Design a protein around this ligand. Structure first.
Ligand SMILES: CO[C@H]1O[C@H](COS(=O)(=O)O)[C@@H](O[C@@H]2O[C@@H](C(=O)O)[C@@H](O[C@H]3O[C@H](COS(=O)(=O)O)[C@@H](O[C@@H]4O[C@H](C(=O)O)[C@@H](O[C@H]5O[C@H](COS(=O)(=O)O)[C@@H](O)[C@H](O)[C@H]5NS(=O)(=O)O)[C@H](O)[C@H]4O)[C@H](OS(=O)(=O)O)[C@H]3NS(=O)(=O)O)[C@H](O)[C@H]2OS(=O)(=O)O)[C@H](O)[C@H]1NS(=O)(=O)O
Ligand SMILES: *[C@@H]1O[C@H](CO)[C@@H](O)[C@H](O)[C@H]1NC(C)=O
Ligand SMILES: *[C@@H]1O[C@H](CO)[C@@H](O)[C@H](O)[C@H]1NC(C)=O
Ligand SMILES: [Ca+2]
Lengths: 417, 54, 234
């Protein structure tokens, strides 16, 4: 059975413990709920990025899929109860959504991903590898396992953590590999899983878009990059002029949208003013202001200086999330996951969540329409040229056009090397 | 081939022929010399002159 | 420009540069004198708010010596068309006169007849600007200049896909691949006689930039010295 064309309540629905909390028009072909479960992620994405930002060095590149990190903990929200769930509800902002959704949610999140899966791969490539992991001994629910299969993709994979732990760890990794066909690997580090690691969250993504309008390699050359630590750098700097959508907000930060093939997936970049420190932008980042950056965009003839870069991120989500209010989900002494087991003695929790994202960005892209123009080629330039030479600290965003989902979030700090 | 045809009438700039005979003139900012076949500037930075101060 | 080189201090003082409110060049000029600038017509067509910067040889780094003047009066040749690129020229009167200095001085304007017989017959001239450097490459940071053999009118025509007005003229190397390119329009094309340079044509159009058997098209100044100084009297 395929979820991308199979409404809920067409499969065992309405699970155990369902949480309850004490004019904007819907786009073209779209389900009111998806667009909902979607905007929720958006709400969640900014907060999270922020925290995860302090966890690292202003000089380390950043990358990730809020939507993944989001959808995963949705497979937990699925089988959670009491004071534990509430949290998972208010930290992933799933408390805004309506009744139904806030229940079958785990399903929609799927129905969402699919949509975002096609358009993406249709012209470009998006690989994902994510599963939930638990020890043998524990006898996991039969149902959840059924749900988890036809919703998150696969069931839960029991491993011998207690037995030969590491033997199991490095067994997960390999799995990621045989799925992301190489690209992502070592999702989980060393000294992450020991003889207590009962349950771990694992979501990982790879993405390499395709420019709607390529970049000539022949116009790529080593130039300088002015790091935030003050330092200098030499990276591969690409370059091309064309009409793109763009906006210089009042503040002055610069918003550039570069579409991938088909204009279904664009990757806007946020390049602040040199006066401004990419951090302040990050310190002051809100969902409300993510809006301003896009809400008003104009198509202009702007020259784009963008670097060629790669970014592979691996990190424990637990550290962060915790600080954000999710506590119980990770404390054995006080959990509430009677949905995936309900038998032990309050013996089920999450030891860690491993998110591994990887982004590629070379000149590549294409449509190659044709030499569709054979007229007098005036030798003057566009009087209204505007330039975007992102040869310094800039944010990254990868979204869906109609739905406006923030697929990928990220930051380019150190390109060169 | 005759007047201005031959070595541009030994002038320094423009060549003509008022009264079946060679005549010279100069671009604005210049002043023909008393010898009549050479253009002597009128100021410091005159047209066509690559700025060279050293 | 495509090929050529880089005007060393004071080799192309007349080069001017039109720039926008966001500050960006996009059309060469030709200092005709302390007030009037000589540029292309198509340059201002879809333009909007600009200014002329003089004697600046580097855009990535401003270091004085460079001056920014404002435009008091724009005058496009009333008979210009983006459909024939004929009459692609225009004169610019600034609001506050230029102050000549190194890297900054005019270029002389020939006298019709003499011109057509002494500069136009000459073998080469020098176009310059901050254009690209391949049909669709990068903009130049610095001010390149390049020499260009005049081309046989009757030949120009056989190579041209588009007609060639007697207002135009060709300049390119039969096989060498160097030329003027986008960002260069409106720039100077000066021809030397003795120790003086005269402006001869304006950087207009062309098919691509340095294509096989394709030539550089320049507005024949020598055929406007009239409409010019006429304009030079508003
Ligand atoms: C307490 O009240 C709350 O719960 C009750 C009961 O919930 S329960 O079912 O869990 O018990 C809710 O009532 C129930 O929900 C109804 C509902 O969702 O409207 C209804 O759901 C069924 O019927 C829906 C309407 O169908 S339709 O024929 O009128 O279209 C259907 O919703 C439609 O889904 C499709 C879809 O998902 O494909 C939507 O298509 C739209 O998007 C598609 C692309 O999606 S994508 O993901 O973005 O890619 C496009 O291809 C398509 O073009 C586009 N339509 S378009 O016009 O824009 O082009 C379509 O818009 C939706 O209307 C339900 O599918 S579902 O996926 O949305 O769930 C379907 N589910 S089903 O039950 O399995 O069949 C239930 O019948 C109804 O039960 S009830 O007993 O009758 O009440 C109640 O709404 C809820 N109140 S609330 O929570 O506060 O809001
Ligand atoms: C969990 O759920 C209910 C609240 O609905 C609570 O009364 C109960 O004590 C909690 N703990 C359990 C599972 O006994
Ligand atoms: C992935 O694993 C399967 C089953 O173990 C194996 O058949 C396949 O060869 C692996 N991937 C490849 C193509 O190497
Ligand atoms: Ca400069």
């Amino acid at each position: 059975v395929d979820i991308c064309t199979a409404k809920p309540r067409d499969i065992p629905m309405n699970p155990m413990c369902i949480y309850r909390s004490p004019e904007q028009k819907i786009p073209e072909a779209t389900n009111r709920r998806v667009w909902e479960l979607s905007k929720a992620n958006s709400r969640f994405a900014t907060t999270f990025y922020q925290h995860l930002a302090d966890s690292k060095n202003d000089n380390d590149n950043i990358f990730l899929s809020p939507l993944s990190i989001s959808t995963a903990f949705a497979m937990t929200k699925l089988g959670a109860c009491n004071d534990t769930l509430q949290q998972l509800m208010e930290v992933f902002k799933f408390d805004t959504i309506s009744e139904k959704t806030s229940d079958q949610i785990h399903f929609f999140f799927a129905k969402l991903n699919c949509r975002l899966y096609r358009k993406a791969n249709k012209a470009s490539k998006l690989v994902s590898a994510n599963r939930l992991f638990g020890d043998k001994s524990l006898t996991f629910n039969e149902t959840y396992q059924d749900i988890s299969e036809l919703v998150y993709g696969a069931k839960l994979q029991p491993l011998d953590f207690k037995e030969n732990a590491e033997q199991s760890r490095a067994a997960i990794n390999k799995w990621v590999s045989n799925k992301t066909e190489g690209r992502i690997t070592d999702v989980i580090p060393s000294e992450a899983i020991n003889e207590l690691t009962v349950l771990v969250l694992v979501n990982t993504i790879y993405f390499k878009g395709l420019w709607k309008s390529k970049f000539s390699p022949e116009n790529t050359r080593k130039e300088l990059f002015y790091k935030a630590d003050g330092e200098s750098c030499s990276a591969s700097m690409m370059y091309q002029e064309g009409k793109f959508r763009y906006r210089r907000v009042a503040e002055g930060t610069q918003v550039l949208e570069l579409p991938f093939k088909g204009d279904d997936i664009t990757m806007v970049l946020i390049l602040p003013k040199p006066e401004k420190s990419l951090a302040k932008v990050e310190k002051e980042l809100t969902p409300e202001v993510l809006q301003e950056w896009l809400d008003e965009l104009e198509e202009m003839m702007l020259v784009v200086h963008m670097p060629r870069f790669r970014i592979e991120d691996g990190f424990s989500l637990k550290e962060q999330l915790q600080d954000m209010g999710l506590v119980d989900l990770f404390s054995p002494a006080a959990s509430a996951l009677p949905g995936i087991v309900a038998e032990g003695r309050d013996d089920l929790y999450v030891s860690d969540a491993f998110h591994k994202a990887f982004l590629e960005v070379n000149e590549e892209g294409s449509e190659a329409a044709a030499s569709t123009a054979v007229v007098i080629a005036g030798r003057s330039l566009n009087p209204n040229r505007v330039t975007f030479k992102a040869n310094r600290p800039f944010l990254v965003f990868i979204r869906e056009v109609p739905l406006n989902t923030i697929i990928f979030m990220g930051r380019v700090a150190n390109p060169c090397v | 081939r005759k007047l201005c045809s031959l070595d541009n009438g030994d002038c320094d700039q423009f060549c003509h022929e008022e009264q079946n005979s060679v005549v010279c003139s100069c671009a604005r900012g210049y002043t023909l010399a008393d010898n009549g076949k050479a253009c002597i500037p009128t100021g410091p930075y005159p047209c066509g002159k690559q700025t060279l101060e050293r | 420009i495509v090929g050529g080189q880089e005007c060393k201090d004071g080799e192309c003082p007349w080069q001017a540069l039109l720039i926008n409110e966001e500050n960006e060049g996009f059309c060469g000029g030709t200092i005709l004198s302390e007030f009037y600038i000589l540029t292309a017509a198509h340059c201002l067509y879809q333009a909007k708010r600009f200014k002329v910067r003089v004697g600046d040889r580097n855009t990535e780094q401003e270091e004085g010596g460079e001056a920014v003047h404002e435009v008091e009066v724009v005058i496009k040749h009333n008979r210009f068309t983006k459909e024939t690129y004929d009459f692609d020229i225009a004169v610019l009167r600034l609001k506050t006169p230029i102050t000549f200095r190194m890297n900054v001085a005019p270029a002389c304007l020939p006298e019709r007849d003499w011109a057509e017989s002494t500069l136009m017959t000459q073998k080469t001239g020098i176009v310059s600007g901050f254009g690209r450097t391949h049909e669709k490459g990068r903009q130049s940071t610095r001010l390149k200049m390049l020499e260009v053999p005049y081309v046989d009118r009757n030949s120009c025509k056989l190579s041209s896909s588009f007609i060639i007005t007697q207002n135009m003229f060709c300049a390119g190397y039969d096989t060498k691949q160097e030329d003027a390119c986008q960002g260069d329009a409106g720039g100077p094309h000066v021809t030397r006689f003795k120790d003086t340079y005269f402006v001869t044509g304006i950087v207009s159009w062309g098919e691509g930039c340095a294509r096989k058997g394709k030539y550089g098209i320049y507005t024949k100044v020598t055929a406007f010295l009239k409409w010019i100084d006429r304009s030079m009297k508003t």
